[PDB]
């Protein structure tokens, strides 16, 4: 599924991401824009051999199981393929664990490089939320 911007904002808000660990909704929408372009089916291989999955590009080294990332963990207790669903529940639940891990949203490199410190409220502009 390719989410609309406001469509994703509403779903993220419903699932309790707005101000989760202090991060406003616009931070989460911005992260998803640059991680996946709002496409739930996005997958991208990383140089370490892991793969990142879904709307928030949750990675197989620590967070989900894909059976092909040696030495990895599955801390969200989920198959990585379950993060590609049109229903973002699994991705949100896993993102809550990631953002609680110690480094906040810096865990998403695209968030640090492209959203952090910017006018992230722009990402929810015009949305009836
Ligand atoms: Cl957009
Ligand atoms: Cl915001
Ligand atoms: Cl594995
Ligand atoms: Cl699995
Ligand atoms: Cl933080």
Curated annotation (Swiss-Prot):
Q: Which Gene3D superfamilies match?
A: 1.10.530.10
The record's Gene Ontology cellular component field reads: cytoplasm; endoplasmic reticulum; extracellular space
Cell compartment(s), UniProt: Secreted
Q: Where does substrate bind?
A: 101
Function summary: Lysozymes have primarily a bacteriolytic function; those in tissues and body fluids are associated with the monocyte-macrophage system and enhance the activity of immunoagents. Has bacteriolytic activity against M.luteus.
GO MF annotation terms: beta-N-acetylglucosaminidase activity; identical protein binding; lysozyme activity
What additional remark is attached to this entry?
A: Lysozyme C is capable of both hydrolysis and transglycosylation; it also shows a slight esterase activity. It acts rapidly on both peptide-substituted and unsubstituted peptidoglycan, and slowly on chitin oligosaccharides.
Q: What are the protein's UniProt keywords? A: Allergen, Antimicrobial, Bacteriolytic enzyme, Disulfide bond, Glycosidase, Hydrolase, Secreted, Signal
InterPro entries per the record?
A: Glyco_hydro_22 (IPR001916), Glyco_hydro_22_CS (IPR019799), Glyco_hydro_22_lys (IPR000974), Lysozyme-like_dom_sf (IPR023346)
| Single biological process term from Gene Ontology | cell wall macromolecule catabolic process
Under PANTHER family, the record lists:
LYSOZYME C (PTHR11407:SF28)
Please give the positions of the paired cysteines in each disulfide bond: 6-127, 30-115, 64-80, 76-94
Q: Which residues form the C-type lysozyme domain?
A: 1-129
Q: In which tissues is it expressed?
A: In the egg white and polymorphonuclear leukocytes.
> Where the protein is mainly located, per its record?
secreted
Q: How does it assemble?
A: Monomer.
Q: Which reactions is this enzyme annotated as catalysing?
A: Hydrolysis of (1->4)-beta-linkages between N-acetylmuramic acid and N-acetyl-D-glucosamine residues in a peptidoglycan and between N-acetyl-D-glucosamine residues in chitodextrins
**Which protein, by its recorded name, is this?**
Lysozyme C
Natural source organism: Gallus gallus (Chicken)
Gene behind the chain: LYZ
């Amino acid at each position: 599924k390719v989410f609309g911007r406001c469509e994703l904002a509403a779903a993220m808000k419903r699932h309790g991401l707005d101000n989760y660990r202090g991060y406003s909704l616009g931070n989460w929408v911005c992260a998803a824009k640059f991680e996946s372009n709002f496409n739930t089916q996005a997958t991208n291989r990383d140089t370490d051999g892991s793969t990142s999955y879904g709307i928030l590009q949750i990675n197989s080294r620590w967070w989900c199981n894909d059976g092909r990332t040696p030495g990895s963990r599955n801390l969200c207790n989920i198959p990585c393929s379950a993060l590609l669903s049109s229903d973002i529940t699994a991705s949100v639940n896993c993102a809550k664990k990631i953002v609680s891990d110690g480094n906040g949203m810096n865990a998403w490199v695209a968030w640090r490089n492209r959203c952090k410190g910017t006018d992230v409220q722009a990402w929810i502009r015009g949305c009836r939320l």
